[PDB]
């Protein structure tokens, strides 16, 4: 996260860390949606251009963290995966359209003051909060500058941008399964996600029922916090039926 600040303890209890077993490294961000399912970006697991294709056996999920490198004994929980499900129409060949994946944990995790799931939006919440000008929050342990890694979880609040502005800031073909966010060069406010933050959550707090909903997943950007560029996020609500389907077809 570029121009974000350190998170407070327990600020994003749904934040997950995809960790590689060997070499031991931070792979991506992710989110806890129930006691057995984690949501992340499909490019974090499968990206043929860079010969990236991870499997169950190659990853670990660390939940309840704050510090990026320390094993927070008695605070974090580490789980193994039972299954990984990538959206069948994930388009890695062109624009990372439908950049979403679900991971089923080997065993359910127990909640705590540091571990709690986030809510997935319903048509009405999506409709009222996903409007240009409304701010959302992104969290992650990713880089601090384009080219600078934090010790703790960072947070930045960003505005959703109008779709034409998003389409006119890039040469990539944007689809309805994406939305972009960030400040305009003109707003003298900065902030953005960056390498290492992929897969993490873009969340909003409902003023109707005070709950936090995950509206997007960090998907892609061109550099980090560049002026005139914005970050793109998977549109969770547009892919919710796929989510529901794998969950009640394969578990809960």
């Amino acid at each position: 996260i570029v121009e974000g600040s350190d998170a407070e303890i327990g600020m994003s209890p749904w934040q997950v860390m995809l960790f590689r077993k060997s070499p031991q490294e931070l792979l991506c961000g992710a989110s806890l949606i129930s006691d057995r399912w984690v949501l992340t970006a499909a490019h974090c697991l499968l990206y043929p251009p860079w010969d990236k294709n991870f499997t169950e056996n190659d990853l670990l999920v660390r939940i309840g963290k704050h510090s990026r490198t320390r094993y927070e004994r008695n605070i974090e929980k580490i789980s193994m995966l039972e299954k990984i499900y990538i959206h069948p129409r994930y388009n890695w060949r062109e624009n990372l359209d439908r950049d979403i994946a679900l991971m089923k944990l080997k065993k359910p995790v127990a909640f705590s003051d540091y571990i709690h799931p986030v809510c997935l939006p319903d048509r009405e919440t999506a409709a009222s909060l996903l409007q240009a000008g409304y701010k959302g929050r992104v969290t992650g342990w990713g880089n601090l500058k384009e080219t600078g890694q934090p010790s703790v979880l960072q947070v930045v609040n960003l505005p959703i941008v109008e779709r034409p502005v998003c389409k006119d800031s890039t040469r990539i073909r944007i689809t309805d399964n994406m939305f972009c966010a960030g400040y305009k060069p003109d707003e003298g406010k900065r902030g953005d996600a960056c390498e290492g933050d992929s897969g993490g959550p873009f969340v909003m707090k409902s003023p109707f029922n005070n709950r936090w909903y995950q509206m997007g997943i960090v998907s892609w950007g061109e550099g980090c916090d560049r002026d005139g560029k914005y970050g793109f996020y998977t549109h969770v609500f547009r892919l919710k039926k796929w989510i529901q389907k794998v969950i009640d077809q394969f578990g809960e």
């Binding site: 960790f19 077993k21 031991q24 490294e25 931070l26 670990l60 660390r62 490198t69 320390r70 094993y71 580490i78 193994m80 890694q149």
Partner: peptide, 10 residues
């Protein structure tokens, strides 16, 4: 940079 994690998770 990452601190070692306990062996029963590998």
């Amino acid at each position: 940079d990452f601190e070692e994690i306990p062996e029963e998770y590998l």
